[PDB]
Structure formats: C-alpha cells, structure tokens
PDB file of C-alpha atoms in Angstrom:
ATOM      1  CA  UNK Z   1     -41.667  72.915 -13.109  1.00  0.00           C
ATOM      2  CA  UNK Z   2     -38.820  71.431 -10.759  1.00  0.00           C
ATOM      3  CA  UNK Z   3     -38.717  67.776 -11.767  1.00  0.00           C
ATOM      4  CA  UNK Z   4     -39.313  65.432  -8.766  1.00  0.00           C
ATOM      5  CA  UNK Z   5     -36.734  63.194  -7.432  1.00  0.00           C
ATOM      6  CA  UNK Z   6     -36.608  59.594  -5.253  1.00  0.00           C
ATOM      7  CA  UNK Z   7     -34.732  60.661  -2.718  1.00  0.00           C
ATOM      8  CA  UNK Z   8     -34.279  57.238  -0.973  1.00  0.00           C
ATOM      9  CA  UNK Z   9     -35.406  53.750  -1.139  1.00  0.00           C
ATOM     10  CA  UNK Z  10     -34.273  50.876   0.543  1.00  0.00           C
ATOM     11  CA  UNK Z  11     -35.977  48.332   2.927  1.00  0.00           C
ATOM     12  CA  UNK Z  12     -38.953  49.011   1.869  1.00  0.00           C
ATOM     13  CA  UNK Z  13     -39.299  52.925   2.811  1.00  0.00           C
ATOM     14  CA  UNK Z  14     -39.534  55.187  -0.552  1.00  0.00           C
ATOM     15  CA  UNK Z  15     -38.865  58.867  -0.105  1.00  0.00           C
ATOM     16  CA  UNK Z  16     -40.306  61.368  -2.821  1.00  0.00           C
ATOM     17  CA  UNK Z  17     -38.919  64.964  -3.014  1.00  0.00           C
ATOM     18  CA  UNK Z  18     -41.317  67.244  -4.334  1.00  0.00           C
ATOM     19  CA  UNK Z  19     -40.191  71.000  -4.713  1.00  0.00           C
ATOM     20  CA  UNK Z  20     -41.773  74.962  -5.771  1.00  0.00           C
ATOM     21  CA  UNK Z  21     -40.025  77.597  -5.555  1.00  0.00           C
ATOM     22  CA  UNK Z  22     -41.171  80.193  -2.841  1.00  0.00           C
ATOM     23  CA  UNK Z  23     -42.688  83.763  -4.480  1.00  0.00           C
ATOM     24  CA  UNK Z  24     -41.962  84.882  -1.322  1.00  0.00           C
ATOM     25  CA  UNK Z  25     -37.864  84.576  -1.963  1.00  0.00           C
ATOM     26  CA  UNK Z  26     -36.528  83.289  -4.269  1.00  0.00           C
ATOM     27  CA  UNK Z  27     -33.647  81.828  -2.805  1.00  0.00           C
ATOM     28  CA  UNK Z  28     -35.890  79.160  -0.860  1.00  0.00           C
ATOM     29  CA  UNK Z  29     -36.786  76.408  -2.500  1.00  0.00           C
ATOM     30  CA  UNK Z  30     -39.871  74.448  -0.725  1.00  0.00           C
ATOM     31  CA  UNK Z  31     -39.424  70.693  -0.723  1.00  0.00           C
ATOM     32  CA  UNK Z  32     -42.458  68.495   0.353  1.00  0.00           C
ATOM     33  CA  UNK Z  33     -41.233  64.650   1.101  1.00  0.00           C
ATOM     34  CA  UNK Z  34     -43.572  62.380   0.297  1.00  0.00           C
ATOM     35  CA  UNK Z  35     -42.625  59.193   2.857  1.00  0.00           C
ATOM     36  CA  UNK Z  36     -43.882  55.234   1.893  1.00  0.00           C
ATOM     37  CA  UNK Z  37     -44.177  51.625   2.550  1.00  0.00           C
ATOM     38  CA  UNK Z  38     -44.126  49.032   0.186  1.00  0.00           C
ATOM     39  CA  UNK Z  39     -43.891  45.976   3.259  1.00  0.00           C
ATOM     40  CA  UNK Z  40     -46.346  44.314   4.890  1.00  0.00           C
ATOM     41  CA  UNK Z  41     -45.937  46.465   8.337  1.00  0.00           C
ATOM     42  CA  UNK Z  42     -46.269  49.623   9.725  1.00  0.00           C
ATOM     43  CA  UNK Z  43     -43.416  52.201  10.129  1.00  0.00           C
ATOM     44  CA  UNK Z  44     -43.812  53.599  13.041  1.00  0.00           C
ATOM     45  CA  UNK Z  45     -42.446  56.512  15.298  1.00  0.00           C
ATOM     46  CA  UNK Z  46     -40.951  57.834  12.054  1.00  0.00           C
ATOM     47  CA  UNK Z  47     -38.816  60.547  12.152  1.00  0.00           C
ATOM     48  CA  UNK Z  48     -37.185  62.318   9.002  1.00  0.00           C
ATOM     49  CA  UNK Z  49     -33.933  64.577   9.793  1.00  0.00           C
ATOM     50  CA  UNK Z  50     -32.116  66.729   7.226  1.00  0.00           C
ATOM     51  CA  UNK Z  51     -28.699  68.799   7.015  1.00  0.00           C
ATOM     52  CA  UNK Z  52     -27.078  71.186   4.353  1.00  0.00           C
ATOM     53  CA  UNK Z  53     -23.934  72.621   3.984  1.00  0.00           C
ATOM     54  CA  UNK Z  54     -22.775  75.494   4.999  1.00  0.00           C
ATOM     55  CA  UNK Z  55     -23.903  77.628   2.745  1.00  0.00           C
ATOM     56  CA  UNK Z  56     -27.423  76.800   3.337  1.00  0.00           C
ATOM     57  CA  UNK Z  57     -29.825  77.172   5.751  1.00  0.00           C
ATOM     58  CA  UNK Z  58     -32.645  74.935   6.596  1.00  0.00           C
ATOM     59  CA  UNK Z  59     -36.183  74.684   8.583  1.00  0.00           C
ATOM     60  CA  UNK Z  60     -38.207  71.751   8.964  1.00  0.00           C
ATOM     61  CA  UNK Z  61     -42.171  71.878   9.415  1.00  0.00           C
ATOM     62  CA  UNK Z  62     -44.105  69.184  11.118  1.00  0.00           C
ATOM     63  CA  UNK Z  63     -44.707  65.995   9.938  1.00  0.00           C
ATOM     64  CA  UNK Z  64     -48.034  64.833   9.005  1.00  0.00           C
ATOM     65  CA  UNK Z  65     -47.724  61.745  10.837  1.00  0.00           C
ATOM     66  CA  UNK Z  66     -45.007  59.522  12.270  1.00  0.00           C
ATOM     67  CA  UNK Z  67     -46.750  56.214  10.667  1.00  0.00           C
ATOM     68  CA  UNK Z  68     -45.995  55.280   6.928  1.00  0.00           C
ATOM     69  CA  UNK Z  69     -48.628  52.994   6.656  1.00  0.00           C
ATOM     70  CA  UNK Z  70     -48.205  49.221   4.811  1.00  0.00           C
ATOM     71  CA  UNK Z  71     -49.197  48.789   1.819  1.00  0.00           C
ATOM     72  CA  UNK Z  72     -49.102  52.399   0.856  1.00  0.00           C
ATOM     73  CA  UNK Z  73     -52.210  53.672   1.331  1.00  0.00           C
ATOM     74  CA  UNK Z  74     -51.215  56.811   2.491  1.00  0.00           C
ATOM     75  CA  UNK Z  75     -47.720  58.579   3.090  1.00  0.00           C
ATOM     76  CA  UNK Z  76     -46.459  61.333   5.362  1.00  0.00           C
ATOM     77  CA  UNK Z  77     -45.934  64.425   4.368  1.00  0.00           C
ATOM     78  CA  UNK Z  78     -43.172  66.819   5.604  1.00  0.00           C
ATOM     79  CA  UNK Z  79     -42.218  69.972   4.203  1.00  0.00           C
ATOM     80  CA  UNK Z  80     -39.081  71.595   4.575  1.00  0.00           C
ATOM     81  CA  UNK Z  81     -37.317  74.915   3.923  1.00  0.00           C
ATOM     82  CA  UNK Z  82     -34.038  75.401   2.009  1.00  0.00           C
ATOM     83  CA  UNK Z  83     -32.289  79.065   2.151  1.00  0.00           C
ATOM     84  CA  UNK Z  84     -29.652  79.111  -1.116  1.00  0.00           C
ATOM     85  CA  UNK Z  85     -28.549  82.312  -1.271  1.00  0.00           C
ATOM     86  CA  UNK Z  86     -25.268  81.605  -3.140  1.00  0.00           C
ATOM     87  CA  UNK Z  87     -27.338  79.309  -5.706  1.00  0.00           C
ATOM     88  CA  UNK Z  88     -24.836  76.335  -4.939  1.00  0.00           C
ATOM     89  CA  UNK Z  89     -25.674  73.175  -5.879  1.00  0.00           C
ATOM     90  CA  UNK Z  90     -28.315  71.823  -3.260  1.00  0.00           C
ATOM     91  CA  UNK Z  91     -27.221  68.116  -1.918  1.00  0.00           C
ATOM     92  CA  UNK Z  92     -28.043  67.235   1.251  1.00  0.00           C
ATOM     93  CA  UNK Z  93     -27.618  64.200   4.283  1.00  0.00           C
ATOM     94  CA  UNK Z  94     -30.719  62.635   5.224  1.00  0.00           C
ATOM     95  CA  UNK Z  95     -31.170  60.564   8.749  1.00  0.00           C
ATOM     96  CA  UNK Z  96     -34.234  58.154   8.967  1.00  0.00           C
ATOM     97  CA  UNK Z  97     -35.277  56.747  12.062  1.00  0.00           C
ATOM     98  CA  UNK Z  98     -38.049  54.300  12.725  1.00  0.00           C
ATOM     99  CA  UNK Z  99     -39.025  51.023  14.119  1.00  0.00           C
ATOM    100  CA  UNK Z 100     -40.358  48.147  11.914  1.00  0.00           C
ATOM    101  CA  UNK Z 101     -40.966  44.565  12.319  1.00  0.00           C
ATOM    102  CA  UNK Z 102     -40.405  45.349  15.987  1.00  0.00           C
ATOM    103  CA  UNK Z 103     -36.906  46.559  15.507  1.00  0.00           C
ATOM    104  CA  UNK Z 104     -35.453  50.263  15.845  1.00  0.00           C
ATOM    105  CA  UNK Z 105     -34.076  51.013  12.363  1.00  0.00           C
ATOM    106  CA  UNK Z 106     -32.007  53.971  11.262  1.00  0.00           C
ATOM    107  CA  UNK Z 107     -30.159  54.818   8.206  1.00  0.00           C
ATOM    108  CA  UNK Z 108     -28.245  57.511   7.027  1.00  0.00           C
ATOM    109  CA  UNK Z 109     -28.078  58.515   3.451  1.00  0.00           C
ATOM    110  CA  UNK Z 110     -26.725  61.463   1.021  1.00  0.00           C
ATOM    111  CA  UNK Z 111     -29.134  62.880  -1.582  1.00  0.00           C
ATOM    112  CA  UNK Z 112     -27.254  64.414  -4.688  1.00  0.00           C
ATOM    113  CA  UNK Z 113     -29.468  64.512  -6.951  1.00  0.00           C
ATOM    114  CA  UNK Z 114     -31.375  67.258  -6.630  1.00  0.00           C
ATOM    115  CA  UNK Z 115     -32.592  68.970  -9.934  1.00  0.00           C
ATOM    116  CA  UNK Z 116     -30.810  71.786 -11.469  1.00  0.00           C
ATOM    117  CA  UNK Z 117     -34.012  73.630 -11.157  1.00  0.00           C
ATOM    118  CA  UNK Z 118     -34.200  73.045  -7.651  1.00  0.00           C
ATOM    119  CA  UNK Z 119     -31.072  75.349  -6.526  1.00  0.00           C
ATOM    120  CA  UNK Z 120     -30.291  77.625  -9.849  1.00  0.00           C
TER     121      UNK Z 120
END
C-alpha cells in the first residue's frame, strides 16, 4: 500500500489523497481526492484544480459532485492521473474554488507531502 495523505485543511474543507498505482503503467500513479466539510454549510460550485512540474504530466476526471455537503455526510470524489516517468519526487499546487457562507472563496496551496510510495 501507498499510505494516504491530508492534502489540505483549512476553513473547514479537508482534502484526502488516496493513491494505487496503475497495472496499466507503472509510471501513473492514480490519486482519488476525497473532498469534506466539517461547517455548518454547504460548499458549493466546488471546483478542485491541480498542476505538476514539468516533468509530469497530469489528467483530471470528473468530479462526483461540486457540493461538499455540511456536516460530512458525504464527500466528492475526483480522481486524477499523474504521468512520472523520471520517478521524481511528486509535489504538486492545488487551487480550490468555491462559495460558502454566501461568499466566493479560493485558496491556493502546495502539497509536498506525497508518500515515497506514491512517485518511486
């Protein structure tokens, strides 16, 4: 097993990296974010947006919702796709965007610490 990481949490918003490793290549590495709310109010119009460096290459799937719901009872669920072929270190710059509490929120944040088992 790849260990899983908290990628982020702040304001309330909690974001869970989960990873495999693809049989189909093994220089992808599958990582399923797990996105949720701890506050008393919807997240809504959420959107998640990564970037790697150079070396990397990246796809992102579709969400499984754009709501992280109060309370946590549920989370969204977004895969996405990193290409390593090098085996650098993975790290990665997350963007969050979403409105709570009536407000448009966005934060930017980095994300380096990512397993060893995740890129090696």
């Amino acid at each position: 097993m790849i260990p899983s990481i908290t990628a982020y949490s702040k304001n309330g918003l909690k974001i869970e990296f989960t990873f495999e490793r693809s049989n189909t290549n093994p220089s992808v590495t599958v990582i399923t974010i797990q996105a949720s709310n701890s506050t008393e109010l919807d997240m809504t119009d959420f959107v998640f947006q990564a970037a790697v460096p150079k070396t990397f290459q990246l796809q992102e799937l579709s969400p499984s919702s754009s709501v992280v719901p109060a309370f946590n009872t549920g989370t969204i669920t977004q895969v996405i796709k990193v290409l390593n072929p090098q085996k650098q270190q993975l790290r990665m710059r997350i963007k969050l965007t979403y409105n709570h509490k009536g407000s448009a929120m966005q934060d930017l944040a980095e994300v380096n610490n990512f397993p060893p088992q995740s890129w090696q």
